[PDB]
C-alpha cells in the first residue's frame, strides 16, 4: 500500500552533536519504515561495513527493533568497531559481539568536530580493570588503580583518571581526525517485527 | 599488580598526554617560524615551557619504577629514555648558570658582528656577509683579515664562557653516572641488553679511529690535489711540503670544501650537469618540484604525502609582509601531521633539498606508528642518512634524464664523472677529518686529557696531524677558535655527521644491490625499485624500537658502521687522484713550512 512514517534517521545521522565513545548514545528505533537504500547509496560515508547481513537485502527484511549507537572516534580506531577486534575502543569503550548482525557506518567529521585550539569535548576511556561485555556502557569516572596503593579518589602515583580527551584539530592527519560512527544493530525477537523495509507498489 | 604492568600503564598515560602537548608546542613553533610576529614568539615560549615542565614532572614520576624489574625491551627503552635527569640532577644555582651561559653563547654567536678597524661605520654579520667573503673571495689578506678578526672577537668573548661550560657539563654528566660530557654524547649509540647486538660507549671512539684510518689515503690524495690547485690559485703562500692555510678552504671554519670547486675543477672545459635553466625554460614551480620528489618516493614503493602535508606546508616564500625563517626544515608535528618549511627557489640545490627533506618526512611517517618516546631515528646518524641517500639518488644523470630535466643526448663520459665525484668529495670527504678532529678534541677536553692552558697548542697540533690544515699565525690561550662554529657554541653533538656520512654510502650500496644496479655506485638510481624501498622501509618503520646495530643488519647486513661503501663510491676518483699525484707529494708536514 501507500507507505508513510519513515524511521527517524535524520535525528541519528544529521545530529548537531555526537556523544563521546565512552558514553555512546543508543537510540531504539521501532514502529516505522526503514529505508536503508538512502544510506547505502549516499556518497557521504567512508565506512559502510555490514556484518551478518548484506546491504542489498536490508530493504526487504523486517526486524523487531533497530539499535542506533552513535559516537565519535579517531579514524585509526574505526577498524576496531568490528566483531573480534582488540584495542582501547573495543576493550574499554565500545565492544561489539562476535555474533553481531548489523552495519557499522562511519564518516569523517573534521569539518564539524575539530577546532583550531583543539576540541576537548570528545573523550574515551583509556583504562578499565576488565574488558567490556558486548553492548555495555561504562560512564563511571572513578580513578583507575594501577598499583597496590589505594587511590582514595585523587589522582597521583599509579592512580590515573580513566577518561582522556582527543583534542581534535583540523590540521590532524586522517588517522587522528574525528570520525562519526553509527552502528545499527538488528535483532529479531518473538514479538511482532515492526521495523520493515519499504514495499514497492 | 607487577612493576612492569604499572610501568606499561604509566607509559600509556604519558604517551597520550605527551602527544597532545608535543603537538601544541610544535604547532606554536611552526606558527613562529612561518610568521615571525611577537604574539607567536609569546605563544611558542609558553608552549615550550609547558612541554619542558611536563617532561620534568614525568621524568620525576618515571624514576619511581626501577629498571631492573622490567624485562620487555620496548618498555625498558622508553623508561630509560624518560628516566634521564638531564640538567635536573645539578643544583638550581648551577643549572641557572648553565642555562644563562648557553643562552648568552647563542646570542654572541647569532648577533656577532665584526668589521675592519679604521672603517667601523657599518659592520658585517657572519651569516650575510662574512660567509660570502669566505666562499667567494680570492684575496689572501682579505680572507686572513676576516678569519682572524672573527676568531679574535668571538673567541676572546667565548673563552671564559666555554671554560665555565666544560666544568658545568662535566659536573652534570658525572652527576648522571657518566665519565664526562663526551661519554654522555657517546651514550646515544649505546646498546645494552641485546645478545650479540650490544654496543658500548667506549667502542664508538675505537670504531671512529678504525674507519678514519681507512679514510686517510683518500683524504691525503684529495688534500694533495687541492694543495696543488690552491698553489696555482695563490702562488707563494702554499708550500709543496706543508699543510693548507686555514683561511683558504672556502668556508669559515673548514667544515666543507665545496666552495673550492671552481679553483680545483678537473675539466673546466667540459659542461656541468646544472638543470636550473631547464626548469626555468619549462616553468617548474616549487609545487612541481615537490610533486616530482613525491613521484620519486612512490616509484621506490614508499607512501605518498598526505593531503594535510600539501594543504598545511609552506613551500614558497610568503612575501615581504610576512616574515619567515628561510632554512629548509621537515616538521613532524605529531598526530599524523607532517609538514615541510622551505623557501623553495628554482635551482638544483632546492630540488635536491626537496628530495632530502621529503626523505626526512618519509622516515617520520614510517616510524609514526611506534610509541611517542620511540618515534625517532635508531641513532642520530640514520635520520640524516636517509635524506642524504635521496639527495644522492636524485642528483644522478639517470634520474635527470628519466624525469626529462636533462637532454636525452647528453654525453656521459669519464671526465664529467670525475668532476662530479670531485665535487661530491669536496662536500663529503673533506668534512670527515674536520668532524673527527673536532669530536676527538671535544672528547679529550671533556675527559680532562687536555688541560685548560694547553687547549689551543693541542688543537692546532691535532689539526695539523689530522686535517692537514695549519694556522696562519700562532694563537695563544686567549683565543677560543673551536667555539666560532655553530654546533660547538650551541651545545650540539658533532659525530652525527661522521656517522651519517658512513651510513649514507652503506645504505646506498645496500639499496643499489637490492635494485640490481650493474655499474658504478655513483651512477646508481633507486627509482622504480620496489625491493629497495621495501628494504629501506623495514628499517624506517622500526624507528627507535630496535637497536641501531639491528637496523643496520636489516639494511646492509652488518652489525657495525663500515667504511668500504664510501671508498667504493669514490674509487674512480681515487684512481684518478693517484694518477694525478705522481709528480706531487702526497701527505703533509706538521712543520710551519707554508706560513706561521
Ligand atoms: C543528512 O545530511 C546529508 C547532507 O546534508 C543529507 O544528504 C541527508 O539527506 C541527511 N539525512 C540522512 C538521513 O542522511
Ligand atoms: C601572519 O601574521 C599576521 C599578524 O599576526 C596575521 O594576521 C596573519 O594572518 C598571519 N598569517 C598566517 C598564514 O598565519
Ligand atoms: C612489550 O610490550 C608491548 C606493548 O607495549 C607488547 O606488544 C610486546 O609484545 C611486548 N614485548 C615482549 C617481548 O613481551
Ligand atoms: C635522577 O636524579 C635523582 C635525584 O638525584 C636520582 O635519585 C636518580 O637516581 C637519577 N636518575 C638517573 C637515571 O640518574
Ligand atoms: C596517494 O596515493 C593514493 C593511492 O594511489 C591515492 O588514492 C591518493 O589520492 C594519493 N594522495 C594524494 C594526496 O593524491
Ligand atoms: C677517459 O677515457 C679515455 C679513453 O680511454 C682516456 O684516454 C682518458 O684518459 C680518460 N679520462 C679520465 C679522466 O679517466
Ligand atoms: C620509472 O617509472 C616511470 C613510470 O613509467 C617511468 O616513466 C620512468 O622512466 C621509470 N624510470 C626509469 C629510470 O626507467
Residue numbers in the entry:
A (entry chain B): 330 to 530
B (entry chain E): 19 to 614
Verbatim from the authors:
SARS-CoV-2 utilizes a trimeric spike glycoprotein for attachment to the host cell receptor angiotensin-converting enzyme 2 (ACE2) and for the subsequent cell entry step which involves the fusion of host cell and viral membranes. Given its crucial role in the viral replicative cycle, the spike protein represents an important therapeutic target and is a critical antigen in host immune responses. All emerging variants contain defining mutations within their spike proteins, with multiple mutations clustering within the receptor-binding domain (RBD) impacting both ACE2 binding and antibody neutralization escape, while mutations within the highly antigenic loops in the N-terminal domain (NTD) across these variants reduce antibody neutralization. Given the rapidly changing mutational and antigenic landscape of the SARS-CoV-2 spike protein, a structural understanding of spike protein mutational effects and the discovery of broadly neutralizing epitopes is of importance.
To identify structural mutational impacts on ACE2 binding we next determined the cryo-EM structures of variant spike-ACE2 complexes. Focus-refined structures of the ACE2-RBD interface enabled visualization of RBD mutations, revealing local structures which are identical to our previously reported structures using spikes harboring variant RBD mutations alone. Superposition of local RBD-ACE2 complex models revealed no significant structural changes. These structural findings confirm that mutations outside of the RBD do not modulate the positioning of ACE2-contacting residues at the receptor interface via allosteric mechanisms. Our structures of VoC S proteins in complex with ACE2 demonstrate minimal structural changes in the RBD, reflecting its functional constraints in cell attachment, only permitting mutations that preserve the ACE2 binding interface.
